């Protein structure tokens, strides 16, 4: 994987450039926001399972057919598979928030999702909808918490949505 520091290092190494003033500024910005990143990661670590449960317990009401027959969460086996996928999404969002980079989000989540989900018949729309619901819950929880900076939290879930979604337009 590559965090923000690693990706900036790779970018400058590509042209064989020493770390210039803009590179130092971006590094300083990441290093100053690291406290808020760690705080948000601690919060999501504390409330991970409950957040995923709430996300599903809103998503299945948004899309009732995912628990009705022929939906892809019908069984308890299917329901646990859906919960495992959403927990995967939350864990990788935590990882991406601490890393300040979506490279992990691509390397270990998105690089085969459409292949796997199409192979299993699993819908790729309700998945991103549940991801966005998780992001909204996370943002509300962080805003309630004493987090001075919270704009970065929307980045990983938004990248998940953009990469795993269908190109409607």
């Amino acid at each position: 994987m590559r965090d923000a520091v690693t990706t900036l290092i790779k970018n400058y190494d590509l042209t064989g450039r020493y770390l210039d003033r803009n590179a130092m500024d971006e590094l300083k910005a990441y290093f100053e926001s690291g406290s808020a990143r760690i705080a948000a990661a601690a919060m999501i670590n504390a409330n991970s399972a409950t957040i995923v449960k709430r996300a599903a317990a809103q998503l299945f009401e948004e899309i009732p057919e995912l628990i009705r027959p022929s939906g892809n969460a019908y069984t308890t086996r299917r329901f646990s598979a859906c919960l495992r996928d959403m927990d995967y999404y939350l864990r990788y969002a935590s990882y991406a928030l601490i890393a300040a980079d979506n490279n992990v989000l691509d390397e270990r989540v998105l690089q085969g999702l459409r292949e796997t989900y199409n192979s299993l018949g699993v819908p790729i729309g309700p998945t991103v909808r549940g991801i966005q619901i998780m992001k909204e819950m996370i943002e509300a929880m962080a805003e309630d918490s004493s987090l001075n900076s919270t704009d970065f939290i929307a980045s990983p879930f938004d990248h998940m949505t953009r990469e795993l979604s269908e190109l409607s337009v």
Partner: protein, 36 residues
């Protein structure tokens, strides 16, 4: 002898229910009820 005629015989046709709107369109169903 003819009891083994499971697949070679005439297949037993099944019934597939036509798909119908579900709870994801409850708002529109209620809108239709009130537009009645």
């Amino acid at each position: 002898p003819s009891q083994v005629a499971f697949a070679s015989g005439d297949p037993i046709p099944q019934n597939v229910a036509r798909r119908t709107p579900g709870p994801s369109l409850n708002r529109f169903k209620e809108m239709a009820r009130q537009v009645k």
